[PDB]
Design a protein around this ligand. Structure first.
Ligand SMILES: *[C@@H]1O[C@H](CO)[C@@H](O[C@@H]2O[C@H](CO)[C@@H](O[C@@H]3O[C@H](CO)[C@@H](O)[C@H](O[C@H]4O[C@H](CO)[C@@H](O)[C@H](O)[C@@H]4O)[C@@H]3O)[C@H](O)[C@H]2NC(C)=O)[C@H](O)[C@H]1NC(C)=O
Ligand SMILES: *[C@@H]1O[C@H](CO)[C@@H](O)[C@H](O)[C@H]1NC(C)=O
Ligand SMILES: *[C@@H]1O[C@H](CO)[C@@H](O)[C@H](O)[C@H]1NC(C)=O
Lengths: 97, 114, 97, 49, 48, 49, 49
């Protein structure tokens, strides 16, 4: 109906071409809110999933605490991480910002 | 090589859940993998420590190995199955002290009774 | 049809058929190539979520550059967008070990 | 959408552990194709008989 | 929609059946790909 | 065809299956392997009307 | 094969013994595995059966 009451948006409009040419674009398997739900639940699982042995238990720990274990695990000592917690958070924030 | 000839630590590579063992048989145009995984159930919530320190001797601290320190005073449980057992030198490692470690002053486990 | 009689009309319609059959075969061949590629890619996405996002990776270059610390995932128009946060060293010095 | 078990974070020096009390084993079955049927064609015969 | 064309199209065999089946399979492939991918992103346990 | 243009060597491509192989690769030297070649045709022994 | 360091030696050990090392390696303690060996074998058997 949009392609009849408004018509094509521009030259070579491939969406309105569907009803003319004989082809159809099909909808995806999941709607947007469901896909968002999957990645949102994934976000909330990060700190407590990559923490210890096995995939069966969940440690509901702060994100920040997770980061410090992750940094310690790559060779930054705890004395360093303890002295620099605000510096580390700021650098992380700059990287994402 | 990853599944059958080895236990995998890669989530989702082999089967779902925690991989234990896989088997292989032939199939009409390939291989049929039979991945046996460990599937947890009936999860409960308990309160855990990041580590424990001797309150009198604050530089002497432990962290659990492949498990957790849980309240019940403190005991150890393996990470995949709740089953409290005493904290011993076989389920702990000595660590540098941290602000998140608990200061314990009474029923100190044997690795801290120094 | 309006201009030609059957013995010639046939030849002209047939040219259009051959061209359109060719077009559809080409289209289908590409949808099969593109869907095969997307499926392989989807398995790569699967591995990255499990290796990158749900775990800290120790595989150089699998996730992002530098030493992997944490990854995040959001949806993208035709897939997933990975956000890999790595540790990047600088100002190296030489010491004797 | 099948929601995951929600585990709350604590405002403390402690954390919540969601830990199994039970378990089962299960089998994920997977098929990997390694071959396709090999076919040759006598093209000259196919086309011209 | 032209009948003369359709009459000639028939002499090319079940052309359109092949087009439809090939695309149907190709389209199922994404629904299966998506279902499998999300089944794996899905968390068991998660914090709010 | 030699440099001087004369034909010094040839393959009758219908003589046998080995000859068919050489002709399909347009060469007197082909690599070792197992190759499919044109089938051995059944021929009519008569007719029915 | 999936028992220790290197790919060069073979430990001819019982399957069951291998399973218990595999379970211990994912976080189930030895006290648990020892108390439940028959329970574990039964669950495994149910999964395959
Ligand atoms: C179990 O006992 C431990 C040990 O006492 C205790 O952790 C300690 O807590 C104190 C605070 O209560 C930390 O001391 C300071 O905390 C402030 C908080 O903002 C920091 O800013 C200070 O850092 C400055 O001073 C440091 C001194 O050397 C400098 O190195 C640093 O760069 C800053 O200038 C300082 O951290 C103390 O550090 C921790 N100890 C450890 C090992 O981290 C612990 O909390 C007790 N357990 C529980 C659950 O209470
Ligand atoms: C509780 O959470 C608030 C959030 O801002 C924080 O400021 C406060 O310090 C926390 N209290 C404890 C005991 O961590
Ligand atoms: C574990 O789950 C099974 C499922 O039927 C049940 O029979 C068994 O009693 C459960 N064990 C515990 C400890 O709840």
């Amino acid at each position: 109906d949009d392609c009849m009451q408004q018509g094509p948006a521009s030259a070579r409009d491939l969406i309105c071409a569907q009803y003319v040419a004989g082809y159809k674009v099909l909808p995806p398997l999941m709607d947007v809110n469901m896909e968002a739900a999957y990645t949102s639940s994934l976000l909330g699982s990060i700190a407590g999933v990559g923490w210890t042995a096995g995939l069966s238990s969940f440690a509901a720990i702060p994100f920040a605490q997770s980061i410090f274990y992750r940094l310690n695990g790559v060779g930054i000592t705890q004395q360093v991480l303890s002295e620099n917690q605000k510096l580390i958070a700021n650098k992380f924030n700059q990287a994402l910002g | 090589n990853e599944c059958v000839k080895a236990q995998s630590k890669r989530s989702g590579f082999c089967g779902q859940g925690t991989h234990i063992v896989s088997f292989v048989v032939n199939a009409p145009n390939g291989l049929y993998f039979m991945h046996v995984g460990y599937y947890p159930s009936n999860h409960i919530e308990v309160v855990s420590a990041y580590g424990l320190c001797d309150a009198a001797n604050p530089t002497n601290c432990i962290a659990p190995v492949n498990g957790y320190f849980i309240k019940t005073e403190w005991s150890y449980t393996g990470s995949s199955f709740y089953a409290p057992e005493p904290i011993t030198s076989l389920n702990t490692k000595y660590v540098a002290p941290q602000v998140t470690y608990q200061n314990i002053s009474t029923n100190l486990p044997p690795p801290l009774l120094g | 049809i309006q201009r030609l009689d059957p013995p010639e009309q046939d030849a002209q319609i047939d040219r259009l058929i051959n061209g359109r059959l060719t077009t559809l075969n080409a289209f289908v061949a590409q949808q099969l190539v593109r869907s095969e590629s997307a499926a392989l890619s989807a398995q790569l996405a699967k591995d990255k979520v499990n290796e990158c996002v749900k775990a800290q990776s120790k595989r150089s270059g699998f996730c992002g550059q530098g030493t992997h610390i944490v990854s995040f995932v959001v949806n993208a128009p035709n897939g997933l967008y990975f956000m890999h946060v790595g540790y990047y060293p600088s100002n190296h010095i030489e010491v004797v070990s | 959408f099948n929601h995951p078990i929600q585990v709350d974070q604590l405002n403390s020096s402690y954390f919540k552990l969601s830990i199994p009390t039970n378990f089962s084993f299960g089998v994920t079955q997977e098929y990997i194709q390694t071959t396709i049927q090999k076919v040759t064609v006598d093209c000259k015969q196919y086309v011209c008989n | 929609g032209f009948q003369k064309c359709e009459q000639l199209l028939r002499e090319y065999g079940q052309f359109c059946s092949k087009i439809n089946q090939a695309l149907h399979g190709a389209n199922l492939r994404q629904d299966d790909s998506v279902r499998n991918l999300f089944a794996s992103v899905k968390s068991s346990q998660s914090s709010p | 065809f030699s440099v001087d243009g004369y034909i010094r060597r040839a393959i009758d491509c219908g003589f046998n299956d080995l000859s068919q192989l050489h002709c399909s690769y347009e060469s007197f030297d082909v690599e070792s392997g197992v190759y499919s070649v044109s089938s051995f045709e059944a021929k009519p022994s008569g007719s029915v009307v």
